[model samples]
Target: HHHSKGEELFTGIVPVLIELDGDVHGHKFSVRGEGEGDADYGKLEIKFICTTGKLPVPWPTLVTTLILCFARYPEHMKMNDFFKSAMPEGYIQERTIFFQDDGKYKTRGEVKFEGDTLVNRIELKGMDFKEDGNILGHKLEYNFNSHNVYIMPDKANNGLKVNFKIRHNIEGGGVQLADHYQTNVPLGDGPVLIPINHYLSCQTAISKDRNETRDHMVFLEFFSACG
Candidate 1:
């Protein structure tokens, strides 16, 4: 919903569409981020600015999955716990998106985590389609850092392994993300001018983890090297 303030609610299930827009750098191509959450829990998905065709960003470099609980952190439960508490619980939802011409497709399953803060397995099955001659059952394995395991069906071919480069932004500069998504850059610090290849940028509410909130602000966000 690109919900202004980026405080969109989501549970553990459903692949929530965080935001969709292309990169803001040199190529001016397309790249969007989608994720999950609940009213009690909000989500913020990070998109790696650079990619080379169907490449998924690595762990630690960017947030692959992030769901936040607004104000007071009323709930401390894991995503699965919060999802289990979803009301009138539904497992699938779909809509028109600019990224695909395949027509709206339903994300039939819920997001389930098989591990912890680091090293985990997440899945969103039941989509019923694919392009690389693979089944819709895709599992992303996290290794804490920037290594991952993407498994596809047809055991004969299995799937692929991916590695990523993660870094921090000094003076709020690093991974040159596309100026499509929104963020809440730090204003408490010295006012500095940060230029972008694409001038179309936004100030949005983001997760505390993304901006390293030392204050009480939970959504004081910024679209840079995550907090």
Candidate 2:
């Protein structure tokens, strides 16, 4: 039986968080994964926050582009047959989403996708530079080569692949000063797995002063069935 809205059940929530520092731009951040109690019938919300120094261009446009890119998941799924085959039989609703940052070269906000409704709230953080100091920027990347197995009724199973890479940059005027980010999510359930079949990358920039941002969210969203 094909599953649709108002006909499915909530299963559980799985949140994954990772903090990396040292290899890239003296950077630090986390992926806060919060489950809405019922995994089978709820949504997943991811939030990001970070800080740096200063940049050369206006802030809002770059960051805004990135958000829209990520939020355009529905449009992406249409191009990938793998996603259609992997879905556990369900329909996704639609909504408005927002992403924002604080006022000091730092971003603080969330993106929520509930039933088909998508919304992003973001604030462009301001920065201060000394002579020719640098400004901070943030970007998200996703790689869907890593595949997992999801068991269904009647002993049927499906392949689940989720992976990507994201990058953040801090610039001095028009040139990049400090930049760093991460790309992860391994393939298979345990020790047995196949090589990654496909790969993709997404990027975004945030300028604090104008509350402006641009996202490649749509590019990355296409890789996962979630989009």
Highest TM-score against the true fold, candidate: 2
lDDT (0 to 1) per candidate: 0.23, 0.25
Candidate with maximal lDDT: 2
lDDT of 2 by residue, 1-227 (tens): 13222212222343322111111233332211211222332233333223232323222222321211121123333242222222222211111112223112333333333344322333333344232222233322221122222211111232323322212232321223121111112122321112224332222221222342422111112212242
TM-score of 2: 0.25
RMSD of 2: 13.6
Residue 212, model 2: lDDT of 27
What value does the lDDT take at residue 193 in candidate 1?
A: 22
Report how far residue 179 has shifted in candidate 1, in Å: 16
lDDT of 1 by residue, 14-45 (tens): 34323222221121222223333333322333
What's the number of clashes in each of the models?
8, 66
